[PDB]
Amino acid sequence: MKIEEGKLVIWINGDKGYNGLAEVGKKFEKDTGIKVTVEHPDKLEEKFPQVAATGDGPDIIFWAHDRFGGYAQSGLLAEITPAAAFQDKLYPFTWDAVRYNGKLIAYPIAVEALSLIYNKDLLPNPPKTWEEIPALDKELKAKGKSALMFNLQEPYFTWPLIAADGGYAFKYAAGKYDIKDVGVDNAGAKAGLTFLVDLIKNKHMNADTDYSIAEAAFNKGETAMTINGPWAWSNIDTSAVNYGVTVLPTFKGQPSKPFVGVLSAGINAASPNKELAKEFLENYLLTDEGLEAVNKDKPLGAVALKSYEEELAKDPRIAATMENAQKGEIMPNIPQMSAFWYAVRTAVINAASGRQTVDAALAAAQTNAARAAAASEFVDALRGDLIQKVSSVMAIADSLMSERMITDELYSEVHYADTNQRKMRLLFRALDSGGASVKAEFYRLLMENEPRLVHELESRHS
Ligand SMILES: OC[C@H]1O[C@H](O[C@H]2[C@H](O)[C@@H](O)[C@@H](O[C@H]3[C@H](O)[C@@H](O)[C@@H](O[C@H]4[C@H](O)[C@@H](O)[C@@H](O)O[C@@H]4CO)O[C@@H]3CO)O[C@@H]2CO)[C@H](O)[C@@H](O)[C@@H]1O
Ligand code: NA
């Protein structure tokens, strides 16, 4: 069988408390005889759909909830249905984060928000505004230090500044996220990214600073500030830096607005171990003792479990995390989120490097995100019709193979399949493997090959 019955394989990111989770797994094993194996592969959030779309992969997948609507829409997750007594154990807003089209699609674990982390010996009174950072850096440079270093390679870390004065992913309106209303190139987003690029041009930051560079400099006492989440606090404790965790700086008087993630655990739709996965998550992990084991390894942030949060709430670092979360926004969980993030990543890296201007970079991200969002929604909405009607499927598959958006394995199956509908049934496995971006590219190719079909179906859709 594809997935092994009688054990649990769990994937979780290498920045989280995976040794603590493995300890919870050992407790489950001693009680049930069911072995629990915890793995942290690189790029797991991309690998998960690549294996789950073919019926393989881990039994349980951990990531922030923004990835989960895409997984659910791609047929990869089991519906979660806790009894009321269990549901009442977690904060209402955490269940909201894992609700997609009426159904719960994961168990929420903990609430993560970025904060400003500062060295209290170098900087007893951290800046309340982004605007005062250049003068602060000039001052620190005279003492052989710098003001601020944080990861500039992942848009998650720059988003709070881009959002502060008006950037947004998708507008919430009429009781839903409007995928036709993207806020990546408005004046607010441009102002925040321009502020960031100006820090780099003026040598207050370097475009190539990444996670490990910023962590190393802060934990060695070389830079006075960094921006990070709760999972980073463990290494800072070891480093002996006298650090504080506080509200992010304002920009143009507005709070920085971090995108808030809820670390969530989904169950693979293909798993033959769903009932014991539910027991593990509800009755071993989501207990005071379970979260304590994980949290002691790497801090989780503010946990979804109300009883355990009582233990954590008086920690000033957790209070700061929640202050920043309340000033930010919970991420959408919609499938289009991955396309938004890929677009914004490119924009920030290109603008920071000088490859593109801020205006050009964000204009391109806006166009690409909007186009992918609409195209992927179409593809998911009209799945049954596309499988029945698309005639150019082998040409589309050939094109996807060239741009490395489909595996040799799945391409092979499409190649050997007989008729168009059968090729399409198989090709949709590759679309479900590659998420919103591959679905968007499928749409673009289809519009090139069969414009009459696309226009006919779009009439029905709208
Ligand atoms: O090829 C470029 C890179 O592509 C891959 O990264 C993608 C992810 O696949 C996307 O999911 C998205 O990432 C988001 C992420 O979904 C979101 O939750 C948030 O991630 C935080 C996380 O919540 C927090 O717990 C902690 O782990 O830090 C994360 C930030 O590093 O923000 C992400 C966006 O920054 O977008 C990225 C690309 O930006 C792939 O993994 C990369 O290796 C690859 O280079
Ligand atoms: Na010290």
From Swiss-Prot:
Organism of derivation: Escherichia coli (strain K12)
Induction: Induced by maltose and the transcriptional regulator MalT. Permanently repressed by cold shock in a PNPase-dependent fashion.
InterPro entries: Maltose/Cyclodextrin-bd, SBP, SBP_1_CS
Record's protein name: Maltose/maltodextrin-binding periplasmic protein
Biological process (GO), any one: DNA damage response
Oxidoreductase keyword on record: no
Family: Belongs to the bacterial solute-binding protein 1 family.
Gene designation per UniProt: malE
Subunit and partners: The complex is composed of two ATP-binding proteins (MalK), two transmembrane proteins (MalG and MalF) and a solute-binding protein (MalE).
Function (record text): Part of the ABC transporter complex MalEFGK involved in maltose/maltodextrin import. Binds maltose and higher maltodextrins such as maltotriose.
Cellular component annotations (GO), alphabetically ordered: ATP-binding cassette (ABC) transporter complex; ATP-binding cassette (ABC) transporter complex, substrate-binding subunit-containing; maltose transport complex; membrane; outer membrane-bounded periplasmic space; periplasmic space
